[PDB]
């Protein structure tokens, strides 16, 4: 039933805050934690993400983590900043300097235990905890380094629970430091082993969407987070509202993950917005599957879909939905592996997101995701063959061997995807 949310680092806290802003609006929860909705569908499964405090007030089951206070101070004074449980703010003061080693081994180790104390207090209040949900980036230090450290500690204490992450992948097109490939490669190895479901959110795709599709001349991190917020609300609809398909984290994993390491999902959203003409079910279906709507900069036609989950939101014709989902499957059947029959599952929700009467959310486990890990691997190797910028990491006690092993395992992940792309 209950999900415990964790958001770590600048990116993780900025996207996590927006996530709670959006679903709070969908569930009728105001910034004060009071309900002011017009439907019971909003409250039927609210306990998945919200604890009910005294006075019938709803408090997100969210834990905010960072090694510097800056970004979390802004969240607390943000629009929905007052809804979060004050005790669930766990922050240090030194920062991680965009250094995976600082988040994972030194600065983060000094803070991790206090984070686990908060996780334990939330989990203990769960009638039947089902898993955890982490928002973070892989290019920084705290979300990447301390985030993966938290996952490892959480798995040790709750090894039979599902671990789900929204992981923002770095891109030179939207880069803060040159060491992002190092931090990302080190993190992917952790995620391959210690998560069940990872939504790959590529800042390269988010930028391209804002620039090409939405015609935003100079996208900001806020514009990128608009797309992330919409995607996160879409892929969690089945967890938050009554439904038959992928209604919990474990059933989602069973339907989406045919092999344990291949659990990195390509999300998509339609319609792409930054308009009063509502789409048609055929238009949602085409855009939902269009590469320009994917949040991971990978061409689906360069690979094959192992599994797909589709979520339609709004009042529409279920008959027409099934016809269109069967249409796209029967026309491009070569891009769906034939050794997993009926690998495309579709869910419908009556409540649409704010500002739209109809929307569609895509979740694909495609072998084309290897292009994303290939990109990171090339950027990693270009620096690592000259051992450039490594002193930032050896200074925190890391050895070069650990980098070689992280590189090797991600190249293995790439080859494992290619194995099933030719099956």
């Amino acid at each position: 039933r209950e999900i415990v949310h964790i958001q770590a680092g600048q990116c993780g806290n900025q996207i996590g805050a927006k996530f709670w802003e959006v679903i709070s609006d969908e569930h009728g929860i105001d910034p004060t934690g009071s309900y002011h909705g017009d439907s019971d569908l909003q409250l039927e499964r609210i306990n998945v993400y919200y604890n009910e405090a005294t006075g019938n007030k709803y408090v997100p089951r969210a834990i905010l983590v960072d090694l510097e206070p800056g970004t979390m101070d802004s969240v607390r004074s943000g629009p929905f900043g007052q809804i979060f449980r004050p005790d669930n703010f766990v922050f240090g003061q030194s920062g991680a300097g965009n250094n995976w080693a600082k988040g994972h081994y030194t600065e983060g180790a000094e803070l991790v235990d206090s984070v686990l104390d908060v996780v334990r207090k939330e989990s203990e209040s769960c009638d039947c905890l089902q898993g955890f949900q982490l928002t973070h980036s892989l290019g920084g230090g705290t979300g990447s380094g301390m985030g993966t450290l938290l996952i490892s500690k959480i798995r040790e204490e709750y090894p039979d629970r599902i671990m789900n992450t929204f992981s923002v992948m770095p891109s030179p097109k939207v880069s803060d430091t040159v060491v992002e490939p190092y931090n990302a490669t080190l993190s992917v190895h952790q995620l391959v082993e210690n998560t069940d479901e990872t939504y790959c959110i590529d800042n390269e795709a988010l930028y391209d969407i804002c620039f090409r599709t939405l015609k935003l001349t100079t996208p900001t991190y806020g514009d990128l987070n608009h797309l992330v917020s919409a995607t996160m609300s879409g892929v969690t609809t089945c967890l938050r509202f009554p439904g038959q398909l992928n209604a919990d984290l474990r059933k989602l994993a069973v339907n989406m993950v045919p092999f344990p390491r291949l659990h990195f999902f390509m999300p998509g959203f339609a319609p792409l917005t930054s308009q009063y003409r509502a789409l048609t079910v055929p238009e949602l279906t085409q855009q939902m599957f269009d590469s320009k709507n994917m949040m991971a900069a990978c061409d689906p036609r360069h690979g094959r879909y192992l599994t797909v989950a589709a979520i339609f939101r709004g009042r529409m014709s279920m008959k027409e939905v099934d016809e269109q989902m069967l249409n796209v499957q029967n026309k491009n059947s070569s891009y769906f592996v034939e050794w997993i029959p009926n690998n495309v599952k579709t869910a419908v929700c009556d409540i649409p997101p704010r500002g739209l009467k109809m929307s569609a959310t895509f979740i694909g486990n495609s072998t084309a995701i290897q292009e994303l890990f290939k990109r990171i691997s090339e950027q990693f190797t270009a620096m690592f063959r000259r051992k450039a910028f490594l002193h930032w990491y050896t200074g925190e006690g890391m050895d070069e061997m650990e980098f070689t092993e992280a590189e090797s395992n991600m190249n293995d992940l790439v080859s494992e995807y290619q194995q099933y792309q030719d099956a």
Binding site: A253, M318, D322, E338, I340, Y420
Partner: protein, 435 residues
């Protein structure tokens, strides 16, 4: 009089069980509070309807049923539904987290910690039986609980009730309403482990019910409510012989005697007619509804009996039907259709007639008809459904897709090929009899 206990496992079994007991109450005149004005033996009796209903000193007629699901949301609808008064808290069993569409999670991990409770609650019902016949078990093939826990329950029931019969009503998976890609795995795992424990199993393919609802009830997108109310009618037609006075299929043993000459081939094909929309009609005759029993479009499992062989055929009429019209229709049908029996069986039909026409739920999708029929024929053509299922199994298992989910629950990978090998022998058993 001999009692029958109904067991409903998983979402499918529970929700179908709900629509059945609602229909039973309407057919017997039992009200949502459990009172039965027509029953003059207050607090007791050994009438035919007492096979499914016990009686309290206060006059409440209580189903001999136990509902079990590893998550509580579905059974909670029973606790708060229209017929909440009928059921007794001990009858409704719920767990915390479900089997996640994983046979191994329902059979081993979660089934091991709730099996003793379910049996104890069943024992409470059995202890109220002067002469228990056996059990009717409702479940899905594709669900983790319907598949995994059912197979464990059937194993223990054969231990605790060795001499009692057990019949299945099973929901065969259909992608149009299925919720999991691994449902072929679960279907074959539960069939393997349950085969030696079930005496007679009635499979219902959701694909068939779905199209019957679309084509005959003009429902653009049927829901589980539409499907379950139609399933309730077929189930009711099958169990009517146990709940009303009669001389055909009056005990669970007779189903095996009449429909299953070979123990392993215990999956009779059910065909129902007429299915008429309530929103619509010219009433169909005995010959027209009987002829409709040989149209694939009306079968609970889509297949072609023309290219198989019959081992037994039972016709169960409800409504204005006299034996004269039944034999005039059969004779006409033998001259126009391909009805080949196995050489070692008589080419004939066992016919039962109940004058009470089918009861329809007020506000439902089905129109009241003056006569209906359900044919139960054990034909080898139903093996087409095993072939489909085994093919999908073969595709995924050749790559070991999703297998790690089952091993992670403590199941050995050898049980996959063990269950598949049992299904291979089953398919050839049908082939030997069918040719």
């Amino acid at each position: 009089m001999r009692e029958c206990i109904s067991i409903h496992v998983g979402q499918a079994g529970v929700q179908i069980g709900n629509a059945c007991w609602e229909l039973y109450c309407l057919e017997h005149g039992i009200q949502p509070d459990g009172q039965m004005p027509s029953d003059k033996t207050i607090g007791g009796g050994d009438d035919s309807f007492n096979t499914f209903f016990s009686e309290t000193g206060a006059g409440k007629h209580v189903p001999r049923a136990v509902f079990v699901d590893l998550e509580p949301t579905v059974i909670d609808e029973v606790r708060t539904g229209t017929y909440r008064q009928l059921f007794h808290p001990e009858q409704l069993i719920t767990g915390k987290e479900d089997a996640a569409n994983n046979y191994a999670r329902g059979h081993y991990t979660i089934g091991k910690e709730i099996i003793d409770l379910v049996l104890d609650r069943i024992r409470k019902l059995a202890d109220q039986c002067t002469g228990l016949q056996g059990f009717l078990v409702f479940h899905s093939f594709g669900g983790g609980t319907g598949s995994g826990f059912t197979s464990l329950l059937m194993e223990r029931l054969s231990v605790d009730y060795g001499k009692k019969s057990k019949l299945e009503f099973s929901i065969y998976p259909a992608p149009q309403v299925s919720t999991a890609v691994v449902e072929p795995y679960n279907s074959i795992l539960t069939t393997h482990t349950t085969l030696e424990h079930s005496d007679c199993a009635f499979m219902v393919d959701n694909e068939a019910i779905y199209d019957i609802c679309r084509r005959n009830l003009d429902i653009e997108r049927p829901t589980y409510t539409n499907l379950n109310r139609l399933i309730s009618q077929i189930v009711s037609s099958i169990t009517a012989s146990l709940r009303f006075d009669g001389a055909l299929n009056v005990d669970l043993t007779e189903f095996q005697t009449n429909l299953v000459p070979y123990p392993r081939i215990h999956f009779p094909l059910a065909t129902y007619a007429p299915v008429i929309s309530a929103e619509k009609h010219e009433q169909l005759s005995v010959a027209e509804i009987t002829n409709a029993c040989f149209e694939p479009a009306n079968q609970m499992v889509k297949c072609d009996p023309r290219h198989g062989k019959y081992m037994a055929c039972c016709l169960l009429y409800r409504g204005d039907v006299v034996p004269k019209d039944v034999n005039a229709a059969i004779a006409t049908i033998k001259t126009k259709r391909s009805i080949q029996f196995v050489d070692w069986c008589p080419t004939g039909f066992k016919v039962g007639i109940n004058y009470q026409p089918p009861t329809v739920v007020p506000g439902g999708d089905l129109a009241k008809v003056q006569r209906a029929v359900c044919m139960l024929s054990n034909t080898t053509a139903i093996a087409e459904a095993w072939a489909r299922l085994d093919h999908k199994f073969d595709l995924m298992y050749a790559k070991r897709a999703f297998v790690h989910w089952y091993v992670g629950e403590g199941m050995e990978e050898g049980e996959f090929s063990e269950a598949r090998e049992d299904m291979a022998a089953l398919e050839k058993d049908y082939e030997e009899v069918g040719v």
